[PDB]
Design an enzyme around this catalytic site. Structure first.
Site, PDB file in Angstrom:
ATOM      1  N   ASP A  31     -11.696  34.733-105.751  1.00 33.71           N
ATOM      2  CA  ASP A  31     -12.818  34.839-106.395  1.00 33.71           C
ATOM      3  C   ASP A  31     -12.667  35.960-107.396  1.00 33.71           C
ATOM      4  O   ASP A  31     -11.846  36.396-107.767  1.00 33.71           O
ATOM      5  CB  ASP A  31     -14.029  35.457-105.194  1.00 33.71           C
ATOM      6  CG  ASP A  31     -15.470  35.000-105.608  1.00 33.71           C
ATOM      7  OD1 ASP A  31     -15.774  34.784-106.532  1.00 33.71           O
ATOM      8  OD2 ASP A  31     -15.841  34.401-104.644  1.00 33.71           O
ATOM      9  N   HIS A  36     -19.853  36.633-106.563  1.00 33.13           N
ATOM     10  CA  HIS A  36     -20.417  37.150-105.417  1.00 33.13           C
ATOM     11  C   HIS A  36     -19.515  37.743-104.796  1.00 33.13           C
ATOM     12  O   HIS A  36     -19.497  37.431-103.228  1.00 33.13           O
ATOM     13  CB  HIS A  36     -21.508  36.662-104.767  1.00 33.13           C
ATOM     14  CG  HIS A  36     -22.665  36.146-105.586  1.00 33.13           C
ATOM     15  ND1 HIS A  36     -23.781  37.213-105.618  1.00 33.13           N
ATOM     16  CD2 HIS A  36     -23.164  35.126-106.299  1.00 33.13           C
ATOM     17  CE1 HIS A  36     -24.778  36.637-106.304  1.00 33.13           C
ATOM     18  NE2 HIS A  36     -24.279  35.314-106.898  1.00 33.13           N
ATOM     19  N   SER A  54     -22.172  28.825-102.277  1.00 38.42           N
ATOM     20  CA  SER A  54     -21.101  29.930-102.240  1.00 38.42           C
ATOM     21  C   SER A  54     -21.194  30.706-100.750  1.00 38.42           C
ATOM     22  O   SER A  54     -20.225  31.364-100.653  1.00 38.42           O
ATOM     23  CB  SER A  54     -21.647  30.921-103.233  1.00 38.42           C
ATOM     24  OG  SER A  54     -20.646  30.984-104.369  1.00 38.42           O
TER      25      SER A  54
END
Length: 272
Positions: free
Chosen positions: A13, A43, A203
């Site tokens: 990520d 996130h 997500s």
């Protein structure tokens, strides 16, 4: 139950705030940054906290005893992330001993096509019995996101608190085979800079599935069986539950079915 420090879950990520208090006591290794969609979820802190948040903190994670590998997919967090950036990240995670690789992002595709570098990285996971778990995408259509739709990947869609698919969660045909619905409405996680919030999206459903997968592998370890991530994927798919009625939603929006943790554990013991 509990995770296990020999079971390794990689988060691929953007930036992750490892200093967030929910990670105090988490087992986290940060790999160095090298020289409607995107492969970064935007996130990373929140996603990581869903799995690794510690039991008495602001975010109780699903598998807080597992070993986390934080793998940056970026060099500059403002720059667009390419398939080669992602492919390199997957490779790095495999080489760092990952059992599970969590990718909470993805890109909308025509029918699941991907660049060679990414195909090869996903093939590597398959060759090495590494489970890739990837977000279905939030386009609300008969649609496929790229990591998620690739062979042997476990695609994760989002369902609400009452077990119904969320309208935004993608339902492309490949997901009927390799996709499962996990909780994706108002999922608790850490905010970068401190505090917590609840957010909705594939997500956030994705790390729930990655965490459960990590728990299943952990149960294999205490049973004296060698961890088998591709088997765990099969068990999660096999135990997934049908959606109650098709007079409100759709049959196709259920994907392979709803995440069923108790059923998955029952199947893991070779039960009925």
């Amino acid at each position: 139950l509990k995770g296990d420090h020999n079971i390794r879950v990689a988060i691929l990520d953007g930036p992750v705030d490892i200093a967030h208090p929910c990670f105090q006591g988490a087992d986290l290794t940060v790999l160095p940054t090298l020289a409607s969609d995107g492969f970064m979820s935007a996130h990373g802190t929140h996603v990581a906290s869903i799995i690794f948040g510690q039991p008495e903190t602001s975010v109780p994670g699903i598998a807080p005893q597992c070993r986390g590998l934080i793998v940056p997919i970026f060099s500059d967090d403002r720059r667009r992330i390419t398939q080669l950036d992602l492919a390199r990240g997957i490779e790095r995670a495999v080489n760092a001993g990952a059992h599970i690789i969590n990718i909470s992002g993805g890109e909308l595709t025509d029918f699941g096509e991907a660049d060679g570098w990414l195909e090869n990285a996903v093939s590597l996971c398959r060759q090495n019995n590494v489970l890739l778990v990837a977000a279905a995408g939030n386009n609300g259509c008969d649609c496929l996101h790229v990591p998620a739709a690739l062979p042997a990947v476990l695609a994760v869609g989002a369902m609400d608190d009452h077990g119904h698919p969320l309208d935004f969660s993608n339902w492309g045909s490949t997901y009927e085979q390799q996709g499962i619905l996990a909780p994706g409405e108002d999922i608790l996680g850490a905010k970068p800079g401190g505090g917590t919030e609840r957010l909705s999206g594939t997500s956030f459903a994705t790390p729930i599935v990655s965490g459960v997968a990590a728990l299943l592998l952990s149960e294999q370890v205490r049973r004296g069986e060698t961890p088998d991530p591709q088997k765990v994927r099969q068990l999660l798919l096999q135990s997934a539950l049908p959606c109650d009625d098709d007079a409100p939603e759709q049959a196709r929006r259920c994907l392979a079915g709803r995440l069923n943790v108790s059923g998955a554990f029952t199947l893991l013991k070779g039960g009925n």
